[model samples]
Target chain A: MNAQAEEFKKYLETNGIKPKQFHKKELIFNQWDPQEYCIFLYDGITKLTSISENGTIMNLQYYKGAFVIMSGFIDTETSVGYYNLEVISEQATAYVIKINELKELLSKNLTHFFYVFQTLQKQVSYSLAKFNDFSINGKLGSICGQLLILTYVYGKETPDGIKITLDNLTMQELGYSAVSRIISKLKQEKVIVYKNSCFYVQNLDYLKRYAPKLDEWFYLACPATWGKLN
Target chain B: NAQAEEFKKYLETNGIKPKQFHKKELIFNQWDPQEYCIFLYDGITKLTSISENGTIMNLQYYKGAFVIMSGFIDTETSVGYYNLEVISEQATAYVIKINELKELLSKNLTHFFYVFQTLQKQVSYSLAKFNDFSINGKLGSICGQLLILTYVYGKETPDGIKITLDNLTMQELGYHSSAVSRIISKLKQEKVIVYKNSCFYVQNLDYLKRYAPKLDEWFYLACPATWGKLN
Candidate 1:
């Protein structure tokens, strides 16, 4: 539980953490049931989705090794329910442990809990920021917001444009019909390009035209996206 | 001191005390800002909010020893996620105006840190529970939701756990009458629960628990009313 060791595990390698591999489209967890394990991703990606009133699946967010915790002391009303997780990547891997096991490990050194707690707090902030933008912004705004997050989390600058894990993503994660429908509109406008199995922002200026107030929401939702830009 | 006792002591020292609400009392709704925080001392309550499509979304339920109604302290990150309505019968709580509570926290660094830790824990838990509801609300099977309801709201009786459905409608629980009828019959046939006098007595807790999802609990309780005019 050394802070230095934990920090080292954050990048380059998964030192103290063991890996669990999952195949494509596997059900990681469901909303209804008792939960015993806490999940952390060491490699690969997963998508979380929730049910809407019409029974349409609304995509919530994508997670990559985010720290998650359950409030064990809470009552039954608060202690049950979970977001459905499915592995979207061809091969995904995670570091999983029972909640009590982690608690027991941390009890030996309270400082370890502090570090883990900070990581969890970052995730909560990121989720809230993303949720704020998703619920408040229009369909276009929400689309841009997701792209911004992806850019922050997985984007790389290239000679042509920013490269991201767009090919690895599905339309369902990108706002389902809302995004696919808009993709048609944007494609016609030459605002984006899909070639070589990668996505490129063909016209950043043009895409920005849809939501002029996007930067404010974008920064709050996922600041990494903002910092990546010039 | 225990965290709960310390929390209670802090509130009482700051002139926060219990207030009572009658059955069906409207504690607050979506329009109000996060002005005050609630510490539920007694009774059951529900938190709900109206969604964009004008449907009532069932948020969570509150029974005993829970944190309710937050987002006033840090409006930037936590405020205005959902508009809520708290409905309850014979509810008792210690209500502290957010500003006053903030003032108290500011005066004592240790108290302030402890309070923030409590609030942060509560908010994180609420987000997790919301994640659960958002996903489950989309699930198609009535059985899944029935299992969730039993896990969250059921109270143990002599022979079994009883879940009161009087406060909730089928639609609110996201089930059609026919779907509910079918599921209830299936549950009864399996000796899972017995429906009597508008209540479901779950004889087999383990069976239901197996179907129940692990929800991370914290923050606001209950469901919202439909947006259309309330008669």
Candidate 2:
């Protein structure tokens, strides 16, 4: 983490926001009650999403060390929208701040307000952009993009390659059977290695070569995962 | 348009001066927005989405509006990658460092309030547009976008409102040209619009309004098309 991120973390800690833990696949927010607190995932991975009418899990946003403000609930009667926060790591913890309390703090501190604003803006913008991309990419290209994102967001650096565990990601989120076939083919091509339920990508160039024309942004955002554009 | 001018004046007074760019110049990509907040002073900007399949999706065209950054400042890299390409002959914008803007908001409560309101409005409106697109099927979605284009890009004329969609094509709008022609014929038959020389003239606002899906009151607050000088 950089200095600014560290300072912001310290600020959140100083403001009396504390951490709460969750197990993998644990439901953090339900539709029945109002979300009383805004959460910032201090560690581990968390996804904000809603299950669609057809049982498709639509991811709205992802957070790690960024605040998830339920601002959409303002002036609404029960928690509106199809959004819920779910833990995606084996074990994860998030800093919890009551929405009412946070609102008061935001009014008092412009920097905090700005931080919240930027965080929300970032999530909204990225989600929308990704949504647009989702419509354009084929199933294989989309899955490859998702893998690249997972590596960037949750992978751990190692001497051999970046290792990412899919323990927390659901089959539905991964497109289930279709993703299974792609993973097997990738493994067969020696582009990626999977063992102990973790994926290890040693040579991103090889992986890129096999993915079938992945988007440039996938490599742009994660330069470590680039081999070729075509 | 005058409101945008006034806002520009306010920005100038606050040390956020505008700069000029020639056509096709890159305003900013997905990676740069985390460091700077961009506000268009004049000219048209096109937003394009890059997919994993190397396909570029034309999202929308903005004329004199605030640019929304899609990624968080503290993250390793922002995922909301986009290309804001200059679509007009010349473009001008005000660029401020994200941190500097944060400091400004911290110091002046009034400025913070005003800025926050506008930013919220833009973000909320964008989200609403996205929702409408995602929910509506192909034909209805195109109709919704046409309504948005009229609301955001239409110019007033004696006949009604004239909207010139130069870069907007059926492929860009995610509709087949045949489907678009069908919709246009339908609209013309209903006396809602006049299609002439590659331009759209909305003959009846009320008739067209019926095609738009109802959204939150905030979504209707401001129209980006109402901002810059109409071409």
Candidate 3:
């Protein structure tokens, strides 16, 4: 969905970086594994998540289609860690380049690196946006906001309403406590119908009221997400 | 001061003038897309949002550096750019033309690297705040914010470290005023923070850090090692 990823892909093909494939549930990178390189996902969804200090695990961030996975490398020699990069889709394809190689290639040609810099900046803004919701809205609003994100990113239109496949574990990972309780309340409100881990949102507007910022939140926090010249 | 001096000096060398802004002042038009990029010389730069219910939310509390708010968005300009006010309360920034900064960044590799490090620092700081919530609740999030404030605008007082932030603005991190007040009352009773002199004072810094750990430093966050164990 991101053109930045497309630009990197073209650069990859031209530079002889080959694509590698992985199936769902495959571990692309381990948390604190001392990353030696960066992964540019050409296609499919991948989750970069980890367990917090309290032993609670959740999806720290999600990368779909085109993106730089984990994105921890600023230089080659330093070892960085934080999140397990795992495939969330049926399969994924990506090109891997060592941190040093990518940085050199990028630094030598500012034209090529501009997009990379922007891609990285977009990610920083996304994290701030993620926390901003929790900063003011509290938990219910946060859980609802995650649901809103899911509806747009992974929603499947069905006569039953917008069916979404998600699990309670992921909800906890998304940083909401009392998942069962919250989901139970959402069900009572009839905002969504759930049988399996899947949810069918009945009215998106009803859900939007809980998280009004969803109307155009990121468009402000991260301008490029909306095609602004930035 | 390496990146700080480099970033500010480069802009100064290019004749990009420095300007100061404060409370309720948005550096760019909140109604339009970003026309200029900013380089913070000092003070708090806020990116805020208001819901239909009048709840306030800040996408980020930018200190010394600012991120490229957006790269490219698929949504409409109005919907996407609404959160891009890029406001501040007593801040000095070297505002430069957006595309001009883009063209400028290319001429120097270190500047390119500086932007990368600054944004990386931005990510780690936000991650620290978000990570607090997976285990800590709303109160924990509030405490974490207070610690950051201590570092950002905090002044040492005879009693404790004073937090100088907007009262109405801080009454909620997008939370209800009643709830925020109740929590503040709790903190005061516990002697973790004291309310006086028209501001909040951190009576016990350690007490607040327990709720919002990994925020041992201020916003610049120049080192990567601090990011690892913290995140």
Candidate 4:
């Protein structure tokens, strides 16, 4: 293999990614397909939702860079259906990997194998929380908290502060879209002051107090101790 | 080193291409045996669900993280979307096959498995918290405090780590922002603690701990369901 190709292999080896390609607005799979092989996007945007009666659409999950979707054969409704996929603008990119192979890898690596089981446990726990919040928190705060919850779990810290992708955003009452929930809180608490296109954090810890429960969600989802387990 | 470059080159050499998506583009739907994973270079992504007809449930979003699905199982479709008009433009990513990559993770000399496990745990944890927030309405004062304490204790940040909750605004504080303020105000009024800027120096953590005993108790209940209120 060429050095770069070998490096790509190594990168995949190190990062646990397989080689796959996606064109702008490519339909990797449809709802009816049951999302068989897990698709990993090195870059680009992707959405997952269902259409309803009277032409109303309900969103289940949104994925950008770090988003993963799976159909739990063991849970919920058992009908496999997918909507459509369109390219956002010009060009988007992504990588596709298979699951059965991943399962094989898990079987070979005992530690990694067990970790997969642990991941399933976390997903169940997360589902439980969402059920509780949606049942009571209403769309507004529940949605807002969900944003913060996701940010804390996957958002990375930059010199500007904690940065998260606005992948699953929608228009709303608040002046800002998507993360407005956190923005409103940040602005009110004087922890964040936005400038240019991005928002910066002045007091990461202080802002944290506003959503301590959100913080808890962060910890629960991405336990620091988990890294050392293997 | 060489391994990293090989992996990047494999995709580059393969000439993998990506596309542009509109506000509502379904990249991949649920229960299909496509067997692929996506690596996000940039852009925003969401994973949600719709009813039989199309009632959307905002399950979650993906940004700097990675989304993975494997095999085919029957269930409601887990959907995805473009959050902001420009967010999709703002990001870039790559798509790859699932099997080609697992061969790499299985290599004993590589640390990729750990990273993969780490992120998997992260997504799973995120899912768990989402469910909790959905189930428990307005996780107000005590729950918030408990959350704070648990994170601080669970994390291995330097030795005597202390957190100052001054950065949060009333709105961002979620349900307990107002109550947290009140508790801080009371603490300040009673001279139990001091607040400067948004940061507070706990002159008396003992008092601070007592201030939110309810939260601690709740934490105990939430985490150690078997403990039975012994604390």
What lDDT does candidate 2 reach at residue A159? 53
Per-residue lDDT for A81-186 in model 3, tens only? 3557788777789788777678767766665676666556667655654555555565666677777767766567777788875545444334333567777788
TM-score of each: 0.51, 0.63, 0.76, 0.36
Model 1 per-residue lDDT at A59: 55
Pick out the ten consecutive residues of candidate 4 chain A with the lowest summed lDDT: A71-80
Label model 4 with its docking quality class. incorrect
Leading candidate by TM-score: 3
| lDDT (Cα, tens digit) per residue for candidate 2, span A1-230 | 33444555677778776668888788667544455455666666667665645666556455554444453432122233445777766778776665556555667765566566665555455445444545544455555656666555556766556776455354234432655766777778755666555667655554443332233444443344343222
Winner by lDDT: 3
**Looking at the true structure's interface, with contacts defined as alpha carbon pairs within 8 Å between chains A and B, what fraction does model 1 recover?**
0.00
List the DockQ of the predictions in order: 0.09, 0.13, 0.36, 0.03
The 10-residue segment of model 2 chain B with minimum total lDDT is B215-224
lDDT agreement with native, every candidate: 0.51, 0.57, 0.62, 0.41
- Tell me which of candidates 1 and 4 scores higher on lDDT: 1
User: Could you give candidate 4's per-residue lDDT for residues B127-168 as a string of tens digits?
Assistant: 334323333324433333434433333222333223333233
- lDDT, candidate 1, A105-212, per-residue tens: 544433444445434444444444444444445566656656655555666767557666544455334442545777787667756666666776656665444443
Off by over 4 Å in 3: A1-3, A23-26, A52-54, A71-81, A108-112, A124-140, A164-177, A182-191, A194-199, A217-230, B52-56, B65-89, B151-178, B181-186, B194-203, B214-231
lDDT of candidate 2 at residue B102, scale 0 to 100: 56
